[PDB]
């Protein structure tokens, strides 16, 4: 049951990607439209890169229906359906119109769906099923890409048409809407429950009609009972009946007692003494029993809280370095595999490309599924180590090919093995990412971590090209094999924190060392501001009024500053871990 939900939700997250990039370009090329210089385009791609920007809204606000995750999912999906149907109805026959604008809107909705789906996956899945869920979601997303790319395009070419294709996709998205309506909802208690407590308590102060005292007090009582059993922040690790947990329970016990007293007064028809009872409740609220509370009721907290959560932990920078460079070898192989097969070896483009497509698809799916099953049967760290070693070793198939003869079977075998190991590593990586989140700020943290993982993959092109054009292909692939060692070293460095999180299920809190972590955070913030200024300058340059050459220097200066901050943070993190070891 749950696995079907994961599969269909991954299908949904993968469905809307192609219509803004490939099918739209095909539609323009058929109708003799260039789709260039429209000034709204080139932002459809930028939605997916910068989807981490509007993340805090997804976890700060709880919509007044379903839950926090499911309500957002339904709103995003229905917005997507309306937008896609509108896109189908729009006819570029007269002129381009705002078609790029609608495409930008659809891209934004799809990015929001991705954020919320990742957050829900992180929230609902248990520790053992993380790998299986990641594998099934990956399977669903690849299936969505497959159906959107070729099948729908062929159907529009032969039977349905460009007019009916988008209605078909909307009709296909509807069943996933009822699926997420049927989907389970996780639990989110403390901050939200105390927020509804405070809202109804403030409503009690304005209560004058003698009837909304009772209903308000009922809401407060249900919220207090729910929040009694949840755990507060900084007490997550002291979960199994700790004295501080006992005092938490004692305070909520007294709070519910005062609520019952006020409710007893209000059932008697009194109002003024009920108001005095709520005032006494608020007075005892202010006392020292108030030890833990929530992030909301302020705008600044909705943004600042996830960052402080993540960067207050221990192992915060080593995990960052691991995420940046774990799948480097696969990126180095993929960057020029096809160029190698076309020029480095004498193979035709068409059949070889198609067979590579099929073999890579099947092999990565099989690798992901097998890794998911093995990780269900194993610990996370051991599976990560095994799969990293395997994906590092499998790259040597291409060195073997480049030195060996020109038979197709050897190339097929090497491709199959490489994509299998890639799928295994992908499943383990997504499991690690889902482990690392917080279930309170899961959306923001997961989006930031995914973008951070892609950042390391982005800058591989020029170096790979220079190496392959300078020293050759077999040397390039031996180097690519030798490049998978840093990820394994990072995995072996931080195994203690991984096993601690596997056992206690809670991340620790850093306390040692001076305020050098603050200096590193300041460096990172300065680098981010410099990157934002550079992006704004590039946006202004897009108007072609004035061009500058020092932006290249500014970008690399900002990158060096950010990387220096990250490396200093990581060395401090490792030193602290070896200090608590010693």
């Amino acid at each position: 049951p749950k696995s079907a939900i994961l599969l269909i939700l991954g299908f949904a997250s993968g469905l809307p990607l192609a219509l803004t990039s490939g099918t739209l370009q095909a539609w323009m090329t058929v109708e003799n439209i260039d789709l260039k210089t429209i000034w709204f385009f080139s932002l459809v791609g930028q939605a997916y890169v910068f989807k981490f920007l509007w993340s805090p809204v997804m976890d700060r606000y709880t919509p007044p229906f379903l839950g926090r995750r499911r309500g957002w999912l339904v709103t995003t999906q229905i917005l997507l359906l309306i937008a896609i149907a509108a896109m189908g109805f729009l006819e570029p026959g007269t002129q381009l119109r705002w078609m790029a604008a609608l495409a930008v809107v659809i891209a934004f909705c799809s990015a929001s769906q991705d954020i919320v789906f990742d957050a829900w996956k992180t929230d609902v899945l248990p520790a053992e099923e993380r790998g299986t869920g990641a594998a099934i979601s990956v399977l669903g997303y690849r299936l969505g890409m497959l159906v959107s790319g070729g099948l729908a395009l062929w159907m529009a070419d032969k039977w349905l048409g460009w007019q009916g294709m988008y209605w078909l996709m909307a009709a296909l998205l509807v069943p996933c809407i009822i699926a997420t309506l049927l989907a389970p909802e996780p639990s989110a208690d403390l901050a939200d429950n105390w927020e509804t407590l405070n809202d109804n308590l403030k409503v009690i102060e304005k209560a004058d009609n003698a009837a909304q005292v009772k209903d308000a007090l009922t809401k407060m009582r249900a919220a207090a009972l729910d929040a009694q059993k949840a755990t507060p922040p900084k007490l997550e690790d002291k979960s199994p009946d700790s004295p501080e947990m006992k005092d938490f329970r004692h305070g909520f016990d007294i709070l519910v007692g005062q609520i019952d007293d006020a409710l007893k007064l209000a059932n008697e028809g009194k109002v003024k003494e009920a108001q005095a009872a709520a005032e006494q409740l608020k007075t005892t609220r202010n006392a020292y029993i108030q030890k833990y509370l929530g992030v909301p009721r302020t705008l600044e907290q909705a943004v600042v809280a996830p960052l402080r959560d993540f960067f207050g932990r221990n192992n915060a920078w080593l995990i960052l370095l691991l995420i940046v460079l774990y799948k480097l070898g696969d990126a180095f192989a993929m960057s020029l595999t096809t160029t190698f097969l076309i020029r480095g070896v004498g193979f035709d483009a068409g059949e070889v490309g198609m067979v590579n497509k099929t073999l890579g698809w099947i092999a990565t799916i099989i690798g992901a599924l097998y890794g998911g099953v093995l990780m269900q049967r194993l610990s996370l760290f051991r599976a990560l180590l095994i799969f990293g070693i395997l994906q590092g070793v499998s790259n040597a198939g291409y060195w073997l090919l480049s030195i060996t003869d020109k038979h197709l079977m050897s190339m097929a075998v090497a491709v199959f093995f490489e994509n299998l190991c890639g799928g295994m590593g992908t499943a383990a990586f997504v499991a690690l990412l889902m482990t690392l989140c917080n279930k309170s700020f899961s959306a923001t943290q997961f989006a930031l971590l995914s973008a951070l993982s892609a950042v390391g993959r982005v800058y591989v092109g020029p170096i790979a090209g220079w190496f392959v054009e300078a020293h050759g292909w077999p040397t390039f692939y031996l180097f690519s094999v030798f490049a998978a060692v840093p990820g394994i070293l990072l995995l072996l460095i931080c195994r203690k924190t991984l096993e601690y999180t596997q056992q206690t299920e809670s991340f620790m809190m850093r306390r040692h060392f001076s305020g050098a972590y603050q200096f590193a955070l300041y460096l990172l913030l300065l680098g981010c501001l410099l990157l934002a200024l550079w992006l704004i300058m590039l946006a202004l340059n897009a108007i072609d009024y004035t061009s500058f050459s020092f932006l290249a220097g500014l970008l690399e200066v900002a990158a060096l500053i950010a990387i220096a901050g990250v490396l200093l943070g990581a060395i401090l993190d490792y030193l602290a871990l070896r200090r608590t070891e010693e």
Partner: antibody
Amino acid sequence: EVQLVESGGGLVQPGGSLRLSCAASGFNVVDFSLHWVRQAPGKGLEWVAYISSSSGSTSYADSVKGRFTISADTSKNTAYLQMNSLRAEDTAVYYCARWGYWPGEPWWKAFDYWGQGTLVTVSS
Amino acid sequence: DIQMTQSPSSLSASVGDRVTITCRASQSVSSAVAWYQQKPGKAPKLLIYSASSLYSGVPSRFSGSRSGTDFTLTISSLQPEDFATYYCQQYLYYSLVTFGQGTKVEIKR
């Protein structure tokens, strides 16, 4: 030697008044709030009234308010439910359940001990 | 007065099959739901309290769980003695006590 016995069915005027007693042996009525629950013949349960003698609190359901009155005496270790101006729909089996004090596990095991029931039937 | 629209509304299963009963609270109630079994001609007995916790005296066959505002009662191995009426009661406050409808399923053999 532990039990909770209810009594009170008898011959009264139709649409008149009648008092029921719930005497509990093995535990005092001070320590547990006493609730009267009615089940109609063939239909489901519904909570009718409650009295708590620790604070003197008392409450009645909306569909019965203003006509019933539930009292108790702790020296005799029993509670009473006096029903006046009865209507045809009132006939049912009355159980006298108990509920523990907040806080603790006594509150959470609501209506842990029940009663054999008394058939209060109103008719002419 | 608002319930989810469902096409399959009835059940038909034989002896020895795992069975489940569900009820949904209209608003948030916390984990204050109890499950009672009443055999014909007797006062109801307390099967489950807190929707998941259990005291002494009851067979380990019965279990309960909660998700959101849904509460479920599970029986693993159906027995000849399990045929009675089953009530879920929310008992949030002393005065706001409400009972469920009740579910009785007959004998399959």
